[PDB]
């Protein structure tokens, strides 16, 4: 269920039919790994199997020593917040001496439990790997002795497997200063991660969404290194919370619109600047100017309200009436009539100016359409490629019906003698007043010229 | 064979002599892995070596289950296209019924083979790993039984080796949602990639170009996960193919050019904005405003037409005549007379204004030159460092001849009383008309005051 509409007069296209999945909040979870505070190896025996356990044990001791040091278009209008501020407040609560202990207590019998912290919040904590029990119960009594022996090399392999997960986790943290994104399968396996989503205090629809799209959740999640004390290592995992789901979303593609005079220096241009994602939200509209920060899986849209603006529903009028009196549609002007192209969701927009060659072709029959000078559109049905001069683009092959909304390019209504071609962050009214300011300028000068003597 | 010219009057420098390797299009390639439809381990033996096979085997079973879940300055003028649209459309064709089966057949006996798809296009395919054959023929009959035995432990290690490649490929996709770039050695070894490049439908020159710089091809490639069914795993690899090669490329460095009055805020500035990469292309010029999207290997230049503009050949006049009548050269204006520096390929440009200390030094003899206020230049021959106050830069030590082309700085020709110092995306004619338009009104207005 995907649609798309192109407005010939505004050189822009709107794709409708998408569904929402906006990150509203955060849940913090504590991940623990039971470590064994091991120091002097007493044994100095000579044996190949022994050597492997020793040098593997030094990798463990070195890894903990590393982590011990670790403990101590219109985007310019968006806000600035600390995304990992939630994890920070949590990991700081872990620095409390009693807080670490309450964790070990809660996870004595089972591997997963909810813990109420000293601040008074309930967070889900879980132990994922137990090296303390393996090392101290199977290795420390051997190594503490003068002459030690290892029978069967499989003992060495079993140790490397259990210890390997720690080194890759340590490796990830040592190059990212304790803040990793996305969250790796080393950091949290899917079997572990789904146990969180299933046990998270969220609604069933939220559960079903996260579970079918875990790889997206990973990218919008942070793994915060917290502390490592007593005989446990802990790090906090910051997970996104989607408070808004399934509201109708739509994407805005824009492209420059210019005149087509033969003399190059005489042309004037205008381009709609509000391209990006729009999603309904409580009668308002959350807007995302940088579509790169949003991920799409199937027909669902995952964005972050962090880089959003809350707009009135009337912003939708800019596509269906750019000269409406209720919302001033933002635009910019220039005299740079250069050929470029924009790929839409079900097709492509083409801005063809000057003598640049602009064509679209089929994989089987070759060129099917050659564009005129100006801004045109074509649907993905039966079209596969698009060429603007030497630049070549491919088009998305997502199915859906597209509709061409014909209309005279709006730039034809502006007198270039008074056109403010130097406005970069403007809008409809901002342009008209700049013209009205320039129109009054010559007019009074004419009136003063008219009433002399 | 690299050169460089500095223009004293426009406060900019051009580096010439490079060669082109611009990606005009894409080639899609299909990678297959024969997997084994495995069910629950029947054996529950109490052997340490067997236990290792069990837990290693579960890494395989979960990895497949993981992927089984997976299938459910002036840059603002550039175009906007979906680069991976080509690979995406292909992976969708794989979802078509019957397409998967004809693949498994075509490369049953051999590995690399050409397959014609349902739509009618020929794509290059290759088999990279057979776990189905090893697991089902050597392990599955054992595990299917109650009591199972593992004798030589070397058997376990060989399984760890074969299975490790699968686990790392699965991990890469789970953190990139099936779209990874560059293409890792896990995704495709160099031996495998050259078998593709040699068998690719490209020109001999393209073959030699890609082969001597494969690591760049990796960076301009995408690995798209496609499908996984019928005891087969497949994912498409999008490869850049360079339709334009060896045309003369040149890189433009720009820096601000200002006046040199003592009084602060009384200075006016002008900066050339069209910095980036330029390459000849079919009598036109492909321009890349974001030089970061371009990679340089030796004297070769690798860019993407996706982030290019196709400009006429006359655009080049901006370096040797910014006041030509055929191309309006883009610039920006400000009253921001701040000191800064730009490192070129064969030297460095220095913008020194106000009371700022600006010097360049040699690694052996220390300070060699002290700059005057304004826009100056120095070549890298015998010079290694550049200092702007306390800020320090190093210079590229690639050899080549640099030329200082003297000429009076163009900013000196502008009347500061009428200079539009508040324009950010302008050009010569756009400012010249703005000056001429703003200059004319006071002239008539003043005469009115006389009588």
């Amino acid at each position, epitope marked *: 269920n995907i649609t798309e509409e192109f407005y010939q007069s505004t050189c822009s296209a709107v794709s409708k039919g998408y569904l929402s999945a906006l990150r509203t909040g955060w849940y913090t979870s504590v991940i623990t790994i039971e470590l064994s505070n091991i120091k002097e190896i007493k044994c100095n025996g000579t044996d190949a199997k022994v050597k492997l356990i020793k040098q593997e044990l030094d990798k463990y001791k070195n890894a903990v020593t590393e982590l011990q040091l670790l403990m101590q278009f219109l985007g310019f209008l968006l806000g600035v917040g600390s995304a990992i501020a939630s994890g920070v407040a949590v990991s700081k609560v872990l620095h409390l001496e009693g807080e670490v202990n309450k964790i070990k207590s809660a996870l004595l019998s089972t591997n997963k439990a909810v813990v109420s912290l000293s601040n008074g919040v309930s967070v889900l904590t879980s132990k994922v790997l137990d090296l303390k029990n393996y090392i101290d119960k199977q290795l420390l009594p051997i190594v503490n002795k003068q002459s030690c022996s290892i029978p069967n090399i499989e003992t060495v392999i079993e140790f490397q497997q259990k210890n390997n997960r720690l080194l890759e986790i340590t490796r990830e943290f040592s190059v990212n200063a304790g803040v990793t994104t996305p969250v790796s399968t080393y950091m949290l396996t899917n079997s572990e991660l789904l146990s969180l989503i299933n046990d998270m205090p969220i609604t069933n629809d939220q559960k079903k969404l996260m579970s079918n799209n875990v790889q997206i959740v990973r990218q919008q999640s942070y793994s915060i290194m917290s502390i490592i004390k007593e005989e446990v290592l802990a790090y906090v995992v910051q997970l996104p919370l989607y408070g808004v789901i399934d509201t109708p979303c739509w994407k805005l593609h824009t492209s420059p619109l210019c005149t087509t005079n033969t003399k190059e220096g005489s042309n004037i241009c205008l381009t709609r600047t509000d391209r990006g994602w729009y999603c309904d939200n409580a009668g308002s509209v959350s807007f995302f100017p940088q579509a790169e920060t949003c991920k799409v899986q199937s027909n669902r849209v995952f964005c972050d309200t962090m880089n959003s603006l809350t707009l009135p529903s009337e912003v939708n009028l800019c596509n269906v009436d750019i000269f409406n009196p209720k919302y001033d549609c933002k635009i910019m002007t220039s005299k740079t009539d250069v050929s470029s192209s924009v790929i839409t969701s079900l097709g492509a927009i083409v801005s063809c100016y000057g003598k640049t060659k602009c064509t679209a072709s089929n994989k089987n029959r070759g060129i099917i359409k050659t564009f005129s000078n100006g801004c045109d559109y074509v649907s993905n049905k039966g079209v596969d490629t698009v060429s603007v001069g*030497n630049t070549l683009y491919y088009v998305n092959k997502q199915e859906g019906k597209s509709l061409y909304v014909k209309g005279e390019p709006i730039i034809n209504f502006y007198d270039p003698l008074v056109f403010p071609s130097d406005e970069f962050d403007a809008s409809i009214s901002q342009v008209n007043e700049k013209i009205n300011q320039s129109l009054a300028f010559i007019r009074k000068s004419d009136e003063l010229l008219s009433a002399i003597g | 064979n690299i050169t460089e010219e500095f223009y004293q009057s426009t406060c900019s420098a051009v580096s010439k002599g490079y060669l082109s390797a611009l990606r005009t*299009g894409w080639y899609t390639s299909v990678i297959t892995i024969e997997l084994s439809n495995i069910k629950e381990i029947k054996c529950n033996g109490t052997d340490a070596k067997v236990k290792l096979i069990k837990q290693e085997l579960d890494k395989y079973k979960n990895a497949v289950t993981e992927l089984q879940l997976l299938m459910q300055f002036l840059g603002f003028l550039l175009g906007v296209g979906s680069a991976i649209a080509s690979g995406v459309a292909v992976s969708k064709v794989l979802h078509l019924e019957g397409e998967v089966n004809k693949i498994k057949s075509a490369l049953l006996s051999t590995n690399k083979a050409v397959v014609s798809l349902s739509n009618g296009v020929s794509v290059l395919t290759s088999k990279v790993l057979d776990l189905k054959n090893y697991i089902d023929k050597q392990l599955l009959p054992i595990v299917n039984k109650q009591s199972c035995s593992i004798p030589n432990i070397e058997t376990v290690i060989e399984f760890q080796q074969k299975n490790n490649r699968l686990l790392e490929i699965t991990r890469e996709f789970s953190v990139n949602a099936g779209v990874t770039t560059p293409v890792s050695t896990y995704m495709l070894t160099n031996s495998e990639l050259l078998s593709l490049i040699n068998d690719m439908p490209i*020109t001999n020159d393209q073959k030699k170009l890609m082969s001597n710089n494969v690591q760049i091809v990796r960076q301009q490639s995408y690995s798209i996960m496609s499908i996984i069914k019928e005891e087969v795993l497949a994912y498409v690899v999008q490869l850049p193919l360079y339709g334009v*090669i*060896d045309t*003369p490329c040149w890189k433009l460095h720009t820096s601000p050019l200002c006046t040199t009055n003592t009084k602060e805020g009384s200075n006016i500035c002008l900066t050339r904005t069209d910095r980036g990469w330029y390459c*000849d292309n079919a*009598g036109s010029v492909s321009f890349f405003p974001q030089a970061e999207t371009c990679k340089v290997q030796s004297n070769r230049v690798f860019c993407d037409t996706m982030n290019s503009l196709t400009l006429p050949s006359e655009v080049n006049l901006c370096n040797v005549d910014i006041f030509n009548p055929k191309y309006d050269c883009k610039i920006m204006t400000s009253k921001t007379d701040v000191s800064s520096s730009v490192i070129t390929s064969l030297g460095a440009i220095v913008s020194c204004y106000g009371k700022t200390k600006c010097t360049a030094s040699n690694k052996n003899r220390g300070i060699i030159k002290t700059f005057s206020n304004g826009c100056d230049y120095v070549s890298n021959k015998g010079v290694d460092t550049v200092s702007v106050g306390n800020t320090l830069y190093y210079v590229n030590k690639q050899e080549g001849k640099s030329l200082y082309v003297k000429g009076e700085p163009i900013i000196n020709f502008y009347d500061p009383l009428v200079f539009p110092s508040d324009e950010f995306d302008a050009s010569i004619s756009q400012v010249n008309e703005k000056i001429n338009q703003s200059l004319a009104f006071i002239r008539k207005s003043d005469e009115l005051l006389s009588a």
Partner: antibody
Amino acid sequence: EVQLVESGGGLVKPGGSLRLSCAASGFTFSSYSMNWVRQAPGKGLEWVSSISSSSSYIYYADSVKGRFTISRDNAKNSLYLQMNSLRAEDTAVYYCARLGYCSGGSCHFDYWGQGTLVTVSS
Amino acid sequence: SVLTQPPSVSGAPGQRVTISCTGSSSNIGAGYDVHWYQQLPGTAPKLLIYGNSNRPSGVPDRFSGSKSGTSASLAITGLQAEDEADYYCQSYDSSLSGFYVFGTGTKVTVLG
């Protein structure tokens, strides 16, 4: 508009040498790849040698490797083909041809010169 | 190997004629594109159709080309006498250090 002018061809004995010259004009020469294609009387067309736009890549047809030497001068708009140990079987009309641009390799020759005749016989 | 064309093709003015260009697995079957060149007798061969199916500027739309599998075809609909000439299809083969391949040639004889 686009022009190509061959020269230098004529009669020479087997084993002799000849340098063919092709002068182009009307466009930006140093941007395109150039090629030589020949044709014996009553026979088909045969590609001889290729040269990149900046001389960086050169290949010869397996029939003539080691005997023919291609060169270009991007400043003179010139293309040269040195031919040594010429044989009577090489007797053909030699055409100067430009390699056009395509989206993805395997390009076409968009413009051709008028050709020069090289006749070798004892 | 080399591309295969029938040497003699005859037709009356206004007839429809097709040219078969049979390749092999080492050229077309590898995916390379096909181009066609028109050679008036004694003249320089000029480009007729490029990119399998595209006519350049100043080529009558009467000419049309197709590519499928390992074969190629050129359609001349409504033949006229100014087309009595030699026609060659051209592609690229990957064997033996690579080399541009040409067809065996088609002399179209307009029965006037």
